[PDB]
Protein backbone atom coordinates (compact mmCIF):
# COMPACT_ATOMS: atom_id res chain seq x y z
CA UNK A 1 0.00 0.00 0.00
CA UNK A 2 1.81 3.16 -1.24
CA UNK A 3 5.64 3.13 -1.63
CA UNK A 4 8.12 4.15 1.13
CA UNK A 5 9.88 7.55 1.45
CA UNK A 6 13.49 6.19 1.62
CA UNK A 7 14.25 8.90 -1.06
CA UNK A 8 14.55 11.27 1.96
CA UNK A 9 16.64 8.65 3.88
CA UNK A 10 20.39 9.39 4.24
CA UNK A 11 22.61 6.63 2.70
CA UNK A 12 26.24 5.90 3.68
CA UNK A 13 29.32 5.41 1.45
CA UNK A 14 30.84 3.11 4.12
CA UNK A 15 33.77 5.19 5.48
CA UNK A 16 35.03 5.38 1.85
CA UNK A 17 34.57 7.54 -1.30
CA UNK A 18 35.38 7.06 -5.02
CA UNK A 19 34.05 8.42 -8.36
CA UNK A 20 31.02 6.18 -9.12
CA UNK A 21 27.66 7.16 -10.68
CA UNK A 22 25.64 6.69 -7.46
CA UNK A 23 22.32 8.54 -7.71
CA UNK A 24 19.17 8.96 -5.58
CA UNK A 25 16.21 11.36 -5.14
CA UNK A 26 16.26 14.39 -2.82
CA UNK A 27 12.87 15.75 -1.61
CA UNK A 28 14.36 19.21 -0.87
CA UNK A 29 15.79 19.28 -4.42
CA UNK A 30 12.58 17.74 -5.86
CA UNK A 31 14.90 15.88 -8.30
CA UNK A 32 17.69 13.27 -8.43
CA UNK A 33 21.19 13.80 -6.99
CA UNK A 34 24.45 11.93 -7.67
CA UNK A 35 26.60 10.88 -4.70
CA UNK A 36 30.05 9.23 -4.42
CA UNK A 37 30.50 5.52 -3.55
CA UNK A 38 33.39 2.97 -3.57
CA UNK A 39 32.27 -0.45 -2.21
CA UNK A 40 32.21 -0.42 1.63
CA UNK A 41 28.60 0.30 2.73
CA UNK A 42 25.40 1.08 0.74
CA UNK A 43 21.87 1.92 2.00
CA UNK A 44 18.46 1.70 0.23
CA UNK A 45 18.87 5.21 -1.29
CA UNK A 46 21.45 4.50 -4.06
CA UNK A 47 21.04 4.00 -7.85
CA UNK A 48 23.34 4.04 -10.93
CA UNK A 49 21.93 7.12 -12.76
CA UNK A 50 19.00 9.57 -13.00
CA UNK A 51 16.98 7.03 -15.08
CA UNK A 52 16.47 4.29 -12.43
CA UNK A 53 16.48 7.18 -9.90
CA UNK A 54 13.54 8.90 -11.71
CA UNK A 55 11.35 5.75 -12.08
CA UNK A 56 11.89 4.63 -8.43
CA UNK A 57 11.65 7.93 -6.45
CA UNK A 58 10.16 10.21 -9.17
CA UNK A 59 7.23 9.57 -11.56
CA UNK A 60 7.32 7.06 -14.48
CA UNK A 61 8.49 8.04 -18.00
CA UNK A 62 8.30 6.30 -21.43
CA UNK A 63 10.95 3.53 -21.31
CA UNK A 64 10.29 0.18 -23.10
CA UNK A 65 11.45 -0.06 -26.75
Curated annotation (Swiss-Prot):
It comes from Bungarus fasciatus (Banded krait). GO terms for cellular component: extracellular space. Changing residue 18 to F: Complete loss of chymotrypsin and elastase inhibitory activity. No change in trypsin inhibitory activity. This is Kunitz-type serine protease inhibitor IX. The lineage of its organism: Eukaryota, Metazoa, Chordata, Craniata, Vertebrata. Keywords: Disulfide bond, Ion channel impairing toxin, Potassium channel impairing toxin, Protease inhibitor, Secreted, Serine protease inhibitor, Toxin, Voltage-gated potassium channel impairing toxin. The record marks 17-18 as: Reactive bond for chymotrypsin. It is found in: Secreted. Its main location: secreted. Disulfide bonds join 7-57, 16-40, 32-53. Negative results: does not show inhibitory effect on trypsin. Dual-function toxin that inhibits both serine proteases (high activity on chymotrypsin (Ki = 18 nM), and low activity on elastase) and voltage-gated potassium channels Kv1.3/KCNA3 (IC(50) = 120.0 nM). Residues 7-57 form the BPTI/Kunitz inhibitor domain. Belongs to the venom Kunitz-type family. Expressed by the venom gland. InterPro entries: Kunitz_BPTI, Kunitz_BPTI_sf, Prtase_inh_Kunz-CS, TFPI/VKTCI-like. PANTHER family: BPTI_KUNITZ INHIBITOR DOMAIN-CONTAINING PROTEIN, KUNITZ-TYPE PROTEASE INHIBITOR-RELATED.
